[PDB]
Amino acid sequence: GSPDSYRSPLASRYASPEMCFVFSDRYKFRTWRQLWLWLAEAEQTLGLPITDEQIQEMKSNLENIDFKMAAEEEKRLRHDVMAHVHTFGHCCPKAAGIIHLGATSCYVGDNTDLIILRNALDLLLPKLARVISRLADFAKERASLPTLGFTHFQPAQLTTVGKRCCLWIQDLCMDLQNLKRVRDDLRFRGVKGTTGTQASFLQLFEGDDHKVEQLDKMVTEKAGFKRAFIITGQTYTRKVDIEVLSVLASLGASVHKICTDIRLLANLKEMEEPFEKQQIGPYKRNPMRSERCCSLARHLMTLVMDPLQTASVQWFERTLDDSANRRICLAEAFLTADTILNTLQNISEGLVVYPKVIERRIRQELPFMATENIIMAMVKAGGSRQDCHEKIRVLSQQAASVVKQEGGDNDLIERIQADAYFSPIHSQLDHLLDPSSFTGRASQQVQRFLEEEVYPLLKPYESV
Amino acid sequence: SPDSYRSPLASRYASPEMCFVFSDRYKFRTWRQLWLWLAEAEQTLGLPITDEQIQEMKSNLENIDFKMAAEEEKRLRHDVMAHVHTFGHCCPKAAGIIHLGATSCYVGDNTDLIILRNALDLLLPKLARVISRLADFAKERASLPTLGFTHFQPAQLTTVGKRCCLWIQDLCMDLQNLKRVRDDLRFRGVKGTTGTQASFLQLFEGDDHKVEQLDKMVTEKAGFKRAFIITGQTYTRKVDIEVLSVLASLGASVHKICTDIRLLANLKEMEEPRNPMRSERCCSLARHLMTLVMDPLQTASVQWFERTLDDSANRRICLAEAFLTADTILNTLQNISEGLVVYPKVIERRIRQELPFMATENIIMAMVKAGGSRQDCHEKIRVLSQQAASVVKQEGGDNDLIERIQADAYFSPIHSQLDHLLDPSSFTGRASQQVQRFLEEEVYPLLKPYE
Amino acid sequence: GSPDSYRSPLASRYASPEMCFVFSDRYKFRTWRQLWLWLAEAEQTLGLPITDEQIQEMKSNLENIDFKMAAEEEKRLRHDVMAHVHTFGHCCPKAAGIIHLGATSCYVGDNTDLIILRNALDLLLPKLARVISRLADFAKERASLPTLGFTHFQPAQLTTVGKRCCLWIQDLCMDLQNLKRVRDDLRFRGVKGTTGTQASFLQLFEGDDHKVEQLDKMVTEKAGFKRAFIITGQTYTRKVDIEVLSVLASLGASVHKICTDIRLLANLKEMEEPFEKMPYKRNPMRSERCCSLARHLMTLVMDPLQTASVQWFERTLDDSANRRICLAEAFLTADTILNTLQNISEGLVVYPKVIERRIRQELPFMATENIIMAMVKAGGSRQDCHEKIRVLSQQAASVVKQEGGDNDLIERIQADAYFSPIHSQLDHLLDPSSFTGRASQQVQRFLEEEVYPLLKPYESVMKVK
Amino acid sequence: SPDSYRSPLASRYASPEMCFVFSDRYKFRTWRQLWLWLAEAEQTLGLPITDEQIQEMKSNLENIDFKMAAEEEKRLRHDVMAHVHTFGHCCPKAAGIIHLGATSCYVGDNTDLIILRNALDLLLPKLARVISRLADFAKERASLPTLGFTHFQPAQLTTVGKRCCLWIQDLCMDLQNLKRVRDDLRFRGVKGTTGTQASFLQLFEGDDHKVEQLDKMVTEKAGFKRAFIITGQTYTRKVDIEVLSVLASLGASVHKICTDIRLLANLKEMEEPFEKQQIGSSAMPYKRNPMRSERCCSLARHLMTLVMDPLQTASVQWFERTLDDSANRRICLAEAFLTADTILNTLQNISEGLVVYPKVIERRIRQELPFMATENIIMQAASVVKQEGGDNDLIERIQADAYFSPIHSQLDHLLDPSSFTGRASQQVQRFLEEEVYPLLKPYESVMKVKAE
Ligand SMILES: [Cl-]
Ligand SMILES: [Cl-]
Ligand SMILES: [Cl-]
Ligand SMILES: [Cl-]
Ligand SMILES: [Cl-]
Ligand SMILES: [Cl-]
Ligand SMILES: [Cl-]
Ligand SMILES: [Cl-]
Ligand SMILES: [Cl-]
């Protein structure tokens, strides 16, 4: 692309070449020809006057596409499909008269879109499986590392770095399920005619309903779909595009949340994005990859409104106000998702943790959450609950004033150590303030989660 | 009071049953229910709770002093502790063990899940019922030809019932979505302030097994098959995305269906049980259902760590509104579907005006079959078509293409064929067989469990 | 009402009584009657058979509204306007025959919607002005107080607490200007008939176009509007609802940003929400609520965008139920947000020693160029000094991250005799006020030039809490 | 290359001029322009910058080595520093003073503002031309009666021109909104990395007036009347909301207009203009699809969808800036303007020679009018129509009944369609003179430019 024209940053800058190719005109028109080859093979099988020589010349010329010629013919014809029937028949002169036999434009246009959507999903699925797997390794590594919990982004009951990572993983697992469900349930349009009635194919087969049904089943199987619609207008219902982009929107919400947490952890200096390759010969580090993931994820959420609106105002058996919008949103949704998953994998590969910063923060906040434990110990040693409460309240106030009014380190535990009133529990104080004892069931939750929910989910993706 | 704003969703639009599901009575009775279950399970697991305490709670689930709870909430600045205190007031014997070990979201967030599920349960039979009425209609009208439209321009004929199947199929997809979401909803259970169950762990003196039993048992008592293992304070707000996304997609389906119905009313081919007001209302509400999807998308995207409370007010609005809106739509769509009136004579007249321009191909094939040239016959049709089209558009007159073809001696080999060549049923392709196969394979089996 | 049914929390928990009333049935049907009165007044002036007695009796019974009779008459008739014509005629027996004369439903329905939108904008405006004024006071108070700057939420060139407050204030001033513009530019529908062509009134005035135009002008002026549409279909263009809810959505975005910043400052213990009628751990719950509701305001913009987009011809009635929801909810949501944000703004809590400690931890890493320059001025080498400061800074950075320790960079500089030509200077070189650039002067000029002048019209309502 | 994806906005849809405004060439020449302006102002303010340094920069604003700059961005990990280095290579005399005292968003963010303003400037005349073509049409059809539609059911007659005025008025509102947003855009200027101008205050050795002078000077050289006083790192992202919200609302207007045209096309009352290849063709198709209208709807829909991107972005900016705005804005701001530009090009084409069939219009009026004239006559046919799809026979029944003898001779006059259109034709004329013409007058000199 020239620097003198706009180039989508989703092609040029962001997405992988594999996803870029799925949405390319090369892939599109090659798949159009592929569909025409399948149609010819099935029509031959069903008794139509098509030869093995005609089939073989189509098969040899699936990739040999004259784009200049197609574009020229599209000018005079003003019909993209017929422009390509012409260009295909030019390089396939024996087969020319039977290309597109009995079909309408959407046999190629709309089935190709479904193949594209399915192949795009099949590119995302393994990438999403891989990021989940890398985060699972991290979660298990850090399963028992105590970290300050945050509710309202204020100190709260301690969690572990790995348990927090499980919140992230779980949302991504829900995405993996949704994506796989939408992919697997996607139906083929098949051979349906202009308004879905198969009137053209019925006539071609001389009123033979069984042959129309069989043809529909054969192209569906050749394209590798399990199932075709029975009911369509001109195209697959545009409710499908809502299903697909809704699950991508939800994925975007998940990633926006995870990468927001990561950016906040980076401010706290508890976690940072992976160190990047050394240049031959820094204190401050910006979580730029997580920022980019948020930025893009937002756009994936935004896009959901396109297919919602499109579907809601489709009139009868189709209106073509779906077409320009789909050319933008379907491709953009997938290229944005791809980019996000490529970046998130890169974030996952060697996340940096600073346990001494984490520890320090716990030591600042934990004492204000440990006071019932200190009361219980005093009471167990023969002390008075009332007096211990009154005394803890006063020392706690003193420490809180050091922290806020003076900008000091929390000295509550040191106040308690120095006060002879707490003499009966001074020897227990390290044990009573052990952060691992305040993480509840965090580490066991990680283990049960990974074994019962995450590994089983990943198992079938081990091939790809 | 007419002196204050009153939700049009509550007063005007939605059913009393769905309004009740989102009422404070339902909410606070469910808080008490969850406190009962917690005590029952805690007793089984060895905690000092008596049968008398449990029976007292059980006799007072509905006995709620909303005035006291609202006054205590002003004092304590804490809705849950306000309801603990109020419940303890009418249950003095149980008062010390209500909420034992629990945190606020044990009642708040589990109650939301209960509500979401019961609201889906109310929608499910309504949607099946609509699909069923429309299916009866599609079957009745499976063979009735009607003009096809692409670009809202005359196209290959369909049937009234085949078109109806486009509508039915989107609604079947909605039905399956709502059911999946309903069945897959998991319980929060007992999870603590940050999801670690630390408060329960301490209540059980470090016994993990007891914590896991408690979680299993309250989940069972609430009638859920599964609880989360992993939470922060609350169930992941991704769940609310999943729920409102299926409602939004439902709204898109309804808007499309009710748009087609409004267009059919302009064409005088079909009417609702004279303006298509029910269909307009459906569209108007369906649009709001689509808009609402952005609320939970945004919310989940900016939850920090184990929860921020910027979810709360938003969810009070969007969750209830989405369900109350969806309910109204289904009640209205039910009324539309019970009384669709078709005017076959209007349909027939429109077909007779448009069909000739679409029959030019079959006229050419018949001339060929009695000897003629393809290219001669195309050019003869082209001139007569051009003339008929001028009469239609330039003169505002009825289409005379068939009369033109009869009056031209060239078409003598065909003249006696013309009535049959332009029989509308012969242009509907496989429409009626598609209806029957769709109803038997796809719709009936879906509906059978609901009947 | 009853706890046995849904009650919108916008009406029952969140919005002010005044905003709730603007969207009430009482207000709506009083305004219908008002519009009937004005119609009758203008109709008499242009010579229609309407007497002072008939007029005086409508004026007497503007508020005397029997809702039960209106509701039963609507159940019988299934037309809200005719039900209200009949109910108004019942208590105005002498005027009954002239009420609604020559008008169509939207004369009352749609003109009332405009009067509501305008009144609702008028309630928001002074609330937004008060928030701006409280925050201006804060920005002035805190103009010179250094604080750590944040880009990517990482340490950056110091700002001041007041300068950062001006980021918030500016966006709110842009919202105030938008709300006012929209309020001012709102046009009346006036008298337009069923399809915008004024046929009913043309015929009522026996073909006199001048009298139809005068009626339109006169009802418009009686309703307090400067200007009526020339062109309508049945109703005002629904593009208007986009204009109004877009400005509210943008206000939501500003508030969401501001309150997200406050939430982050509260985590950092630098700023907290005002003390309520001293606990160590405090949650920024008002700010969280403002974010929550601001989000809904943003969401709602998609309602009028979609509605306008699919209006067929001179009106389709698929706008009606949606507008009953989104127009009221957006204003009630905005009202709540403004009431809450004004509360947040009254007595914000700042912890300067927390702010100072954080600066002391981060500033040395940003001071290393000021130090190099002071070495270069006393003789030394830019490149020499750069390599020595890099090694010590790396050591200090490792104390911070690998050990969880306080930053010791200035201590390591103090203890290294290579820096002896600048040891006397270090206190001055590390003065935080010298790192805030022009923050304090920016505050002063902004408040003088851009904020105080916007507030000037609202001075008489400024002091309410 | 057809072997990767390419935005259909760049290749297929938008005009080359809008495409260029969002191009890398435009971007990076604008960086260099801003660096030149900076140097010129800094020279005036006394910094050691020579006329030769300035002239060397001025001679190389367009001489951009994209390949080298990309490679340098990879080495330095910094887009601005890559461009500083690459510009210093072609301007070795100036190399030492390029970007002097500035920070990254001096070029990045000011360039975005120049782009936004340029883009708006391209849209305005296009919209003005649409409005003018429709105003021509409205005027010529001001009196042509046509069936009014409420609920898309027969309602009080309007006129083809009056109906077109509904479309025009929405677009006039868009044109005023676009103009306001363009006029109100402020320059970021020189603000530093957190908005405090610290780097410039240091460059000028603590002289505040010099910093203020530099901000004023770069703002003036860039053609902006006003700079922000207050920024963080960048201009407030509220500005992006303001700009995309006006485009969204334009999208809504265009969707409604093009939905009406599609419905009229179904009714055969109005069609999209004959394409060049069809004009006078003896091969004119009977069935014409309103494809340009469909396209405009489809695109206008995306415009409306995009409004959620800047809403969300602004809402979650933390403090003096977070860089989660960057990728999103790269997408949405360019897409919104390419989509709008496409819509306006197409809509201008639609507006130039709309096809009207008065005899179709007339026949539909005769079907519905007898039912709307009963009031005037007092001074079954419905069941036939509904059950038989027959022609309306109400008038024919009336002339053949004894009872209506007093009225019979008026029945032609009483059914005159012109008498049912109310004030539609006068409304058109007052609207055009008072509200439309005055808005178009600034655009007189570019009215004649053709559809693309
Ligand atoms: Cl894997
Ligand atoms: Cl077909
Ligand atoms: Cl096909
Ligand atoms: Cl806990
Ligand atoms: Cl709990
Ligand atoms: Cl009228
Ligand atoms: Cl009126
Ligand atoms: Cl700076
Ligand atoms: Cl700068």
Side-chain angles (χ1 to χ4, degrees), chain B residues 372-416:
Chain B
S373 167
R374 179 150 217 100
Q375 278 192 322
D376 280 2
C377 197
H378 168 102
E379 274 287 331
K380 280 274 191 169
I381 291 285
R382 199 195 54 73
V383 301
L384 300 184
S385 277
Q386 287 283 329
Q387 288 170 357
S390 286
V391 168
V392 186
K393 301 191 178 181
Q394 313 271 41
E395 310 180 14
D398 289 0
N399 184 17
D400 60 359
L401 177 59
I402 301 324
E403 289 181 357
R404 279 170 204 282
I405 285 155
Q406 288 162 310
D408 184 335
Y410 178 87
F411 299 101
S412 293
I414 293 319
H415 288 159
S416 66

Side-chain angles (χ1 to χ4, degrees), chain A residues 125-134 458-464:
Chain A
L125 283 162
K127 285 177 179 197
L128 182 50
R130 193 152 28 234
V131 179
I132 290 163
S133 192
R134 275 295 312 193
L458 293 171
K459 181 57 161 178
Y461 299 96
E462 215 154 54
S463 200
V464 73

Side-chain angles (χ1 to χ4, degrees), chain A residues 319-391:
Chain A
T319 48
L320 262 289
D321 63 311
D322 60 350
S323 184
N325 193 282
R326 287 168 70 262
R327 283 194 188 244
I328 299 170
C329 66
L330 306 178
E332 277 196 0
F334 281 94
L335 297 161
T336 299
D338 195 74
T339 308
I340 280 159
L341 294 184
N342 300 329
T343 303
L344 192 61
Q345 175 71 40
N346 183 251
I347 294 161
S348 74
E349 285 178 355
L351 279 163
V352 173
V353 181
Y354 288 110
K356 300 300 188 181
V357 170
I358 294 170
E359 280 163 28
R360 172 166 200 177
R361 183 157 290 100
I362 286 170
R363 281 193 250 107
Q364 295 306 310
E365 301 294 353
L366 191 59
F368 294 118
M369 304 182 259
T371 59
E372 175 62 17
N373 312 71
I374 293 169
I375 297 167
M376 284 172 167
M378 283 291 289
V379 174
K380 179 153 123 90
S384 160
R385 171 171 282 282
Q386 271 292 321
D387 289 341
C388 189
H389 169 83
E390 286 173 23
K391 188 71 138 151

Side-chain angles (χ1 to χ4, degrees), chain A residues 67-115:
Chain A
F67 296 103
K68 179 171 187 164
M69 184 180 311
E72 281 186 276
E73 281 289 333
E74 195 178 350
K75 288 192 201 186
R76 68 178 39 74
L77 293 162
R78 297 176 152 183
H79 200 299
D80 62 343
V81 174
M82 286 309 305
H84 278 270
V85 172
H86 195 268
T87 302
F88 201 15
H90 202 265
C91 67
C92 296
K94 297 172 210 297
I98 60 81
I99 294 165
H100 199 57
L101 185 58
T104 63
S105 312
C106 288
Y107 170 74
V108 293
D110 199 53
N111 284 308
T112 290
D113 285 347
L114 292 164
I115 288 164

Side-chain angles (χ1 to χ4, degrees), chain A residues 134-191:
Chain A
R134 275 295 312 193
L135 295 172
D137 298 336
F138 182 82
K140 192 187 210 317
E141 184 187 10
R142 305 301 181 163
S144 296
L145 183 54
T147 203
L148 186 61
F150 286 123
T151 65
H152 315 255
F153 202 27
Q154 292 295 322
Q157 297 289 103
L158 302 191
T159 183
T160 67
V161 169
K163 175 64 193 303
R164 178 171 288 152
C165 188
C166 288
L167 278 49
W168 304 341
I169 292 164
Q170 170 164 260
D171 276 7
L172 295 170
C173 289
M174 292 166 72
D175 294 316
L176 187 65
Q177 285 166 300
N178 289 339
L179 266 79
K180 184 60 155 62
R181 173 186 53 77
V182 163
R183 186 275 181 198
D184 287 349
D185 287 1
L186 208 64
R187 287 187 246 171
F188 204 56
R189 175 213 188 253
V191 289

Side-chain angles (χ1 to χ4, degrees), chain B residues 2-3 5-6 12-13 19 23-25 280 284 287-288 291 295 298-299 309-310 314 316 321 324, chain C residues 3-4 6-7 11 20 24-26 288 292 295-296 299 303 306-307 317-318 321-322 324 329 332:
Chain B
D3 316 327
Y5 172 73
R6 284 171 292 162
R12 198 180 192 75
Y13 285 132
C19 288
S23 76
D24 289 338
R25 169 163 296 281
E280 288 171 311
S284 199
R287 179 180 312 125
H288 190 59
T291 296
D295 266 336
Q298 294 178 86
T299 294
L309 268 282
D310 61 312
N314 194 279
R316 283 199 192 236
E321 280 197 345
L324 286 161
Chain C
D4 285 21
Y6 186 63
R7 306 178 274 204
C20 283
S24 68
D25 286 344
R26 174 165 281 286
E288 287 177 307
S292 196
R295 177 181 312 126
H296 188 65
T299 291
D303 261 342
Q306 295 175 88
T307 288
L317 268 288
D318 64 317
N322 191 280
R324 281 195 188 245
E329 288 206 323
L332 292 160

